[PDB]
UniProtKB/Swiss-Prot annotation:
Outcome when changing D69A: Impaired ATP-binding. Strong interaction with HIF1A, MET, KEAP1 and RHOBTB2. Loss of interaction with HSF1 and ERBB2. Los of interaction with TSC1
Region of the whole protein represented: 17 to 223 of 732
GO biological process: activation of innate immune response; cardiac muscle cell apoptotic process; cellular response to heat; cellular response to virus; chaperone-mediated autophagy; chaperone-mediated protein complex assembly; mitochondrial transport; neurofibrillary tangle assembly
Residues with the N6-acetyllysine modification: K42, K60
Protein name: Heat shock protein HSP 90-alpha
Molecular function, one GO term: histone deacetylase binding
Post-translational modification: ISGylated. S-nitrosylated; negatively regulates the ATPase activity and the activation of eNOS by HSP90AA1.
Gene name, Swiss-Prot/TrEMBL: HSP90AA1
Region (Interaction with NR3C1): 1-192
Amino acid sequence: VETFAFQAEIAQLMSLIINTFYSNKEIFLRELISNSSDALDKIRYESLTKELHINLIPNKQDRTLTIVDTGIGMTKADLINNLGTIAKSGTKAFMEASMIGQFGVGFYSAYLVAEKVTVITKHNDDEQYAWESSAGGSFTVRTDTGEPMGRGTKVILHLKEDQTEYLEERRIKEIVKKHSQFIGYPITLFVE
Ligand SMILES: CCNC(=O)C1(c2ccc3nc(N)nc(C(=O)N4Cc5ccccc5C4)c3c2)CCC1
């Protein structure tokens, strides 16, 4: 388990997301589905140079909403450096300007609804990694000794006690149909 500090910009952004009163918290899903779509586009665009989909797994017991994709995945180098550089440039752009995704920092909208976010990832020529952050100015990165998932990303949202609506079938179905209705990959909503 390695702990890293977020950079000043990203840290300030997450603080802004968590401490700012904003009721349209449902934007987080569009942002994460979009990110999955790009990762899936990356493994698809690389293929020409197996199954490409997105799964939405709610869990009442653990109080989690998971967004799984079979996209390109991420390396340790992607988790530490790379995501941090993308975010440095992104936060800079989003500050000068709900429109969060246009600046490549839409993932962090997850903190509108999650108290902790766990990111299990696997890239084709690297190991399985687990990224985790409860915001608070830091993130951890470890090698996942957990169940070997296939190439892709698993974004596990540990929902706030008050944000349990994002566990309901009707609600997930309504958000998807509203802002992710033209994604080029099948989106499966798991039941309970
Ligand atoms: C397609 C273009 N992107 C890439 O190549 C990267 C990449 C590749 C696969 C990805 N898969 C998903 N599902 N999501 C993301 C993502 O943008 N984030 C996940 C995450 C976790 C912690 C903190 C911030 C973020 C933002 C991915 C990013 C390589 C580095 C960016």
